[PDB]
Amino acid sequence: KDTPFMVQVKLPNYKDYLLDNKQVVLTFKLVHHSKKITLIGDANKILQYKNYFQAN
Amino acid sequence: KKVVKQKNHVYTPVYNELIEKYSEIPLNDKL
């Protein structure tokens, strides 16, 4: 939470599951320990990803 | 009796390290 990073994670477009149990802990460690994240993509997709991260 | 090697007594955050470094192989002995 003090070590600085600006790491970039891609997010593909599966059916209704929206992440991977292959890649879930690695992409949640960054959102838990980060301070400012940004989202580039489709409108409702980045909306539901903000909702999913803030709600999870 | 056998002990259970009790305490090192100093604490820290764990920090399984995030930022990765390239790990060159240091098997450069004499040649």
Side-chain angles (χ1 to χ4, degrees):
Chain A
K1 63 164 176 177
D2 316 316
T3 73
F5 50 88
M6 207 174 247
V7 64
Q8 165 248 346
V9 182
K10 289 174 178 287
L11 289 171
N13 212 329
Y14 313 100
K15 178 189 171 46
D16 296 22
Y17 201 81
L18 64 74
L19 258 184
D20 296 309
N21 203 355
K22 196 40 83 184
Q23 209 178 320
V24 55
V25 285
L26 198 134
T27 184
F28 259 115
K29 161 179 297 175
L30 315 164
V31 203
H32 288 196
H33 300 79
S34 138
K35 282 207 191 58
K36 291 196 201 297
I37 69 169
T38 196
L39 285 165
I40 307 297
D42 199 315
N44 62 330
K45 294 212 68 60
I46 66 176
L47 279 180
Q48 68 195 344
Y49 270 168
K50 167 202 173 182
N51 294 13
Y52 171 65
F53 282 163
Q54 280 202 357
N56 222 47
Chain B
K1 205 258 174 186
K2 303 301 184 175
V3 290
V4 291
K5 55 177 212 172
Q6 270 86 9
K7 277 310 287 167
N8 301 157
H9 273 298
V10 58
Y11 282 144
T12 180
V14 265
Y15 188 34
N16 294 308
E17 157 64 70
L18 173 70
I19 282 303
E20 50 267 63
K21 306 194 169 304
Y22 314 156
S23 66
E24 71 270 5
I25 178 149
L27 198 65
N28 314 277
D29 41 354
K30 191 184 216 92
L31 73 154

